[PDB]
């Protein structure tokens, strides 16, 4: 095609993310009259999200996904998006990104410093905790070898509840669980399904600890070369796909607990008050490290009412 473009992702071919990316690719090919074709590169084929963000910056990859929280790699105060229990729900995540001074500045910096244009934001689920033994209370987390992505906020979740975090690549997790080299992991339910972690985890605990969004991102080096009518095709398609993406996740969260029960998984509902209490020293440490920019971002987010 005139524009043979590439969209990389860590999620696999059975995931919501892949499904929504297929919708995006289809719409762009149709509405561009075949001028643009977008090929998908799932399962970390091109590296992980940190690696794919570098590739968008350089111009060697055209599209990828990232959470708003992942920009904590560059701007420490952006960890606010994944401090456990701080962001209440997706309504708050949307307003945090688009309707605060903090979020609006972050979007501008992504463009200026990191070479990426934010096309749209979707919901990517709320993280829960699976394990090879029951989590009936925070006490059960003690010494649990909890696999997490290599991201400071997930490492801190594990640390502050008393678990022993082991950071790993997403592709390696299934085998780590199966072999009991680790005792659990902490993705949203849709990823537990997509990765078939339920085949290798007898327990699921509703820890509700981190709220994931998902940003549809384009390399500035690619976006700048598209005539404005094709830029509009891509932007409109990204917005349409994001609504569909969010819907997949919202619908799954209704149904997936019952799906896992029928696969033989036991579900627990530990008291979250001690989980939330355990994070108070982490928020303090966040404010100590990130200074006034962090305190301000927290304030702006804590002001957002979570009811639509
Ligand atoms: C956009 C993306 O790649 N998301 C991935 C996510 C993020 O890397 C971390 O939450 C850090 O932001 O990590 C996973 O949940 C994980 N490795 O278990 C897999 C997700 O597909």
Residue numbers in the entry: 1 to 308
Task: Please give me the paper's original passages concerning this structure.
Tripartite ATP-independent periplasmic (TRAP) transporters are secondary transporters that have evolved an obligate dependence on a substrate-binding protein (SBP) to confer unidirectional transport. We investigated the significance of this interaction using the sialic acid-specific SBP, SiaP, from the Haemophilus influenzae virulence-related SiaPQM TRAP transporter. The first structure of a TRAP SBP revealed that the charge of the carboxylate group of the ligand, sialic acid, was neutralized by an arginine residue, Arg-147, in SiaP, which sequence analysis had revealed to be the most highly conserved residue, being present in 98% of TRAP SBPs of the common DctP family. Using in vitro, in vivo, and structural methods applied to SiaP, we demonstrate that the coordination of the acidic ligand moiety of sialic acid by the conserved arginine (Arg-147) is essential for the function of the transporter as a high affinity scavenging system.
To investigate whether this water network adds plasticity, i.e. ligand promiscuity, we engineered an R147E mutant to maintain the hydrophobic part of the arginine side chain and yet have the capacity to coordinate water 1 and water 3 observed in the R147A structure. In addition, by using the charge-swap from Arg to Glu, we can also assess the ability of the water molecules to dissipate the apparent charge clash. To investigate further the ability of the waters to relax the selectivity of SiaP for its ligands, the R147E mutant was crystallized in the presence of the non-cognate ligand sialylamide, which differs from Neu5Ac by a change of the carboxylate to an amide. The R147E-sialylamide co-crystal structure again reveals a closed conformation with an r.m.s.d. of 0.2 Å from the wild-type SiaP in complex with Neu5Ac. The amide and the opposing carboxylate group of Glu in the charge-swap mutant are linked by the two interstitial waters 1 and 3 in equivalent positions to those seen within the R147A mutant. The presence of the NH2 group results in the slight rearrangement of the water network around this ligand (waters 5–7 in Fig. 5A) as the NH2 group donates rather than accepts hydrogen bonds. In vivo data confirm the in silico predictions as growth of bacteria containing SiaP with the R147E mutation is more impeded than the R147K mutation but less than the R147A mutation. These data suggest that the two waters are able to accommodate two carboxylate groups pointing directly toward each other, while retaining sufficient function to enable bacterial growth. Our crystal structure confirmed that the mutant protein is able to use water-mediated contacts to bind sialylamide, an atypical ligand for SiaP. The finding that the wild-type protein was able to selectively bind this minor contaminating component, while R147E protein exposed to the same stock crystallized with the bound sialylamide, confirms the important role of the Arg-147 residue in the selectivity of SiaP for its cognate ligand.
